[PDB]
Amino acid sequence: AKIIFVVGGPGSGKGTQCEKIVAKYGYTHLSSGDLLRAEVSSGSERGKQLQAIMQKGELVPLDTVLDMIKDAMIAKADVSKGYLIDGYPREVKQGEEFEKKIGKPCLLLYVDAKGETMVKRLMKRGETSGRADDNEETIKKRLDLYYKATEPVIAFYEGRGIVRKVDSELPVDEVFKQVSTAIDAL
Template structure:
């Protein structure tokens, strides 16, 4: 895949949705939200949706390995003219990072929106260490505009080069 792949990680209160929206609007990246894909399948009452609904009813999270084929289908359906992909909210851990990398390709950049009290940090710590050379860890407890301004230099480079020639700056 020639288009950049960006993983954007952050808890529910990190402002991730706002940053994703700003990136999509300014740079034309395609937003891939695995959780929204699951919701759509459940609503459609597809075979996958029925399976996903049963998993959720048991109080479990749908495994990323079960969602990725649907992500791949979405990506393949949008290949022409794509400027990049934003994988929203994943990976949560090393196993999910491996799944994403094997199935979709390695990330060009990882964005970690940090907020105090994020209980998922311990699971994602290994991911951030593995991809440290392409990870932007950003204090997300600031105004959304300030956070976005931190992202702009690297997205400008991605938009211009359509590839991994970025220099992670803070």
């Protein structure tokens, strides 16, 4: 099955574009954030540890997040023609370990937004939906971590040759036209 990495900053619009991909193409959307938050909601001790880390805007250990991604892929294996891996990899080692344990991506969709745009979108969502990490101090930490740890992921897959950038400053449906173009050309 096809594996597509979807990578971009906090609030760049990854999840929004992924849900549109699902509706149009039928791919299986796996969000590392959603999987982690599901563990938090379980009330487990691990969930309490994950909640602490995520509330501070920090990266969860590779071992945990890759386990959950693999778990989810296996659970959907019978019915998936392709996978959207949304929010993983966030560091080069995460990409490397995924390829070691699961397989290689055929495409990385780089959902590109401005830093100020991401701050605005997350501040707005925070005031609306009240997600714990959508507070101003944590947003700043998330964005800084994205720049430091995750942008080298883009470079890695540029070296691989599979990055297609989409301009997430555009309206959602206009971004999705760029997304659709990349997927159609697979």
